[PDB]
Design a protein around this ligand. Sequence first.
Ligand SMILES: [Cl-]
Ligand SMILES: [Cl-]
Length: 129
Amino acid sequence: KVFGRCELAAAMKRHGLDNYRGYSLGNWVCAAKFESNFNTQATNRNTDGSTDYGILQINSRWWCNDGRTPGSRNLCNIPCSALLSSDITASVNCAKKIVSDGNGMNAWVAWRNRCKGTDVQAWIRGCRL
Ligand SMILES: [Cl-]
Ligand SMILES: [Cl-]
């Protein structure tokens, strides 16, 4: 599924991401835009052999099992394919574990490079929330 910007903001708010660990909703919408272009089916392979999955590009080295990332962990206890669903619940629940892990949203390279320190409220402007 490719979400609209406001549709995704609404879904994320419903799932408890607005101000989760102090990160306002716009941060999450911005991260999703630049990680996946709001596409739940996005995948990208990394040089180390791991793959990033779904709307928030969650990585198989640590967070999910894809059966092809040797010696990896599965800290979210889910198959990586669950992160590609039209239902964002699994992605949100895993993202909450990631952002609690110590480096906050800096875990997402696109967030650090393209959202951090910018006017992220713009991402939710105009939306019925
Ligand atoms: Cl915001
Ligand atoms: Cl933080």
